[PDB]
Amino acid sequence: PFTLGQRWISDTESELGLGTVVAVDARTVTLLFPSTGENRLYARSDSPVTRVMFNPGDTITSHDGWQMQVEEVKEENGLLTYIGTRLDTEESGVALREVFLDSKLVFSKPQDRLFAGQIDRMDRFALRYRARKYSSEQFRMPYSGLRGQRTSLIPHQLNIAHDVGRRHAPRVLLADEVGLGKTIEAGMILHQQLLSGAAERVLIIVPETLQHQWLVEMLRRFNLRFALFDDERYAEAQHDAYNPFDTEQLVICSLDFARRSKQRLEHLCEAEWDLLVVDEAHHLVWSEDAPSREYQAIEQLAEHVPGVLLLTATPEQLGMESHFARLRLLDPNRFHDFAQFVEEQKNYRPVADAVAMLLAGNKLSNDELNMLGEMIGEQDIEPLLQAANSDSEDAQSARQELVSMLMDRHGTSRVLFRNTRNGVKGFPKRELHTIKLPLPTQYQTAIKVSGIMGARKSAEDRARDMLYPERIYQEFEGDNATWWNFDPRVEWLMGYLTSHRSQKVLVICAKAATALQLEQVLREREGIRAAVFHEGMSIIERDRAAAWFAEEDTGAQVLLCSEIGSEGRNFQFASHMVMFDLPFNPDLLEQRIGRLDRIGQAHDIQIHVPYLEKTAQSVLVRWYHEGLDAFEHTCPTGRTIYDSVYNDLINYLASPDQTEGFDDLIKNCREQHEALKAQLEQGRDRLLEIHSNGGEKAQALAESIEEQDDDTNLIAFAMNLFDIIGINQDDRGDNMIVLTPSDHMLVPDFPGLSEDGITITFDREVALAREDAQFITWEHPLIRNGLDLILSGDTGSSTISLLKNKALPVGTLLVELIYVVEAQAPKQLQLNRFLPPTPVRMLLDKNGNNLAAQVEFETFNRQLNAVNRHTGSKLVNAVQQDVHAILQLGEAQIEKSARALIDAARNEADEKLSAELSRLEALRAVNPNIRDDELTAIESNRQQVMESLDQAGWRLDALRLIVVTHQ
């Protein structure tokens, strides 16, 4: 709704100051910033702009330097006109059009707000002081940026985020096993760099089929709204900007999209990204002599972007050698010769073996132990070397310090994280239950028709038909034929369901059609609550079913899934899974089990597989269980064996009558399975796996965060904030509030709110079951926004209150003073770790003696009550000459107090920031992956902070006058 002449500020670069609308097109608006004279042009969407308006009672300044007194404001044709009294001339009726406001933003001094008759509420003075205190403590939290995410507190994930999220320009390759949290680790790092101010622009490059998955994860899990950029978006933005990608900070797009034109890929590398994220980097095939035409586009990209996140897989049982092609992109100088990397890794292999011997309870030959000595290049290994091997009292500490020293020399573990399911504990066991049902005669006849008509069709598709009797019975008895009346699986299903009504059951089938038919029969014949869950539904629908399914004991008993989506939400309360059918390939099979076989579930998983006798299913049950052991264990051997046996195994599917030769296929498959399993365990880089999951120290970190999650001041603070803002908070009951606006709202529009309301929860476990709700923490944008609205504004800065105390003299003056110590620095410097805006309360007397250390804040405010507007007004002016003399009294004490905070902070800062620089120097002398850039940033940051801290000042933010009465 932009119309020429409106005033706006930049939410980020207010160091640019105020702006003025100077142009408008269909898609864009142009602001002039008179502070510098520069213009910045933005897209209306994502709108990181804040309205600049003033209220009656404010004192404002005109561009000619004179000021005035706000009395009334008109709006016409999208423009505001301020009407009031000119203060320097005492002329009434002066008008100031918003186009003539100054570029300079001044925050009013509360005494001039009190001198001029502005008295705010006494409950808003209370919130303002509480907010600066609460905000201050959370900024300095050691693990900031690791508490707001809607995830389980899994140590191995949290370790990588802490390690990588704190680096400068991080360039890492995430090769975690599938299902371990690559995208979670990715988002945490993103969540971290955005909160610390180190990054503002993020680019995730995703295959188009996965773009929506990433959009919802960053928005619902990490509170990050990415703008999807397609051709349509790209065309309208080329007209609107020099670089189309300057209109949005966070962008998803496809690599196929990225390679369309060269001018497009040039703009991307010139878009000045702080971080880059690339999913499925294994699709990048690279020959030293012949790089693909795609890899050249990334290598052109990877030369223009500081931070680079690579998500990849190392599938088909290959090693980290396949990763060299990508490692080449992070540090092309570090990785410059293939063969040398192979020799090093080959020479490292024996140590992993000997280490694997170590913790298993083995002795290590001296010749063996004299190969580890070459890796760790020192001379005093032996005393530490033998206790770990001699199995003395401290072999645990001799092992842990030995291994620790080994890790600092690993060639990739600093830049490469690959956690396996064997080096990570916490996953639940999976137990099987099989039920053999008699093949009804109606199908026998039904398959012979498909048999005959299956004259000319591949065994690949002939067996795909024999898989699902349901979908040819809808072709020969007409669609919707009542197959649900004689099939014993349904009879077994109900009986099992009606006998376990108090258990949440996950029921997975192939196609959505079968799920919808199943719901009707379970409902209209057993009164069973069953939600259908297919990809065709909207997110709101899937959220709705998760809610119903999450009701502890009053909701849906069953979740009917068809062709399930790929690793969506967590059903931590569900521990039972039923296979109405089994998919063909073993990868999808583990995916079904994947929605439950996750860290953080309630109990172990019980799997029930009712299968029809003598069908393709009966074949797949034994092969999956006896051959691959795919039900109780998760090893991804299935596809290789599935590919190496396909044409033989297929025929037993396309014709389950011929049973001989089968029983030998199974024992042959189990031989391959155990061998492949064995071969993989012996390829384990157990050092990389131990360094990746963070170990025991990480689990300690995980429990510290588990304790910050009981913050009751937050919940109580939040409501206060809200209620003041004027947000109705209906308590639905299950830790969820519905927030709605009001007629008495304080702002035109709040960033997150809609009139239809939003559901919120403060509990991490409820959040994991209801992703449609907001997981409320100290780091959620809602809180920082409302906080900035208050702490930037001057409401709560001036109020009056009376005190009724028999035990004090009449007419005494108490003045509650909230000074604010502040630094002016870009958020990249991270001053808030050591000196965020920190309140300094002071209760001075008529002689300037401070009582605040003795008089707690909350309790004093409790026993206070307000006055009426008129009497209090000039009651202030009775001592207006007195209080001004009271102020300078504190001026001499804050400078003493200020340096106290500053001095302690500079010690704590130089301590941690030098301790990190010393540690990083130790690795650079010992590891080749530490970059020059890394240490320089810390050094520059250490110097700049201590410099910016030597120039910090204080200011009086809030002021409450106290008058004692005995009335």
From Swiss-Prot:
One of its GO terms (molecular function) is helicase activity. GO terms for biological process: regulation of DNA-templated transcription. A motif (DEAH box) lies at residues 279-282. Keywords: Activator, ATP-binding, DNA-binding, Helicase, Hydrolase, Nucleotide-binding, Transcription, Transcription regulation. SUPFAM superfamilies: P-loop containing nucleoside triphosphate hydrolases (SSF52540). ATP binds at D176, E177, V178, G179, L180, G181, K182, T183. The keyword Translocase does not apply. InterPro entries: Helicase_ATP-bd (IPR014001), Helicase_C-like (IPR001650), Helicase_RapA (IPR023949), P-loop_NTPase (IPR027417), RapA_C (IPR022737), SNF2-like_sf (IPR038718), SNF2/RAD54-like_C (IPR049730), SNF2_N (IPR000330). It is an enzyme of class 3 (hydrolase). Residues 163-333 form the Helicase ATP-binding domain. Residues 489-661 form the Helicase C-terminal domain. Its EC number is 3.6.4.-. Belongs to the SNF2/RAD54 helicase family. RapA subfamily. PANTHER family: DNA ANNEALING HELICASE AND ENDONUCLEASE ZRANB3 FAMILY MEMBER, SWI_SNF-RELATED MATRIX-ASSOCIATED ACTIN-DEPENDENT REGULATOR OF CHROMATIN SUBFAMILY A-LIKE PROTEIN 1. Interacts with the RNAP. Has a higher affinity for the core RNAP than for the holoenzyme. Its ATPase activity is stimulated by binding to RNAP. Transcription regulator that activates transcription by stimulating RNA polymerase (RNAP) recycling in case of stress conditions such as supercoiled DNA or high salt concentrations. Probably acts by releasing the RNAP, when it is trapped or immobilized on tightly supercoiled DNA. Does not activate transcription on linear DNA. Probably not involved in DNA repair. This is RNA polymerase-associated protein RapA. It comes from Escherichia coli O45:K1 (strain S88 / ExPEC).
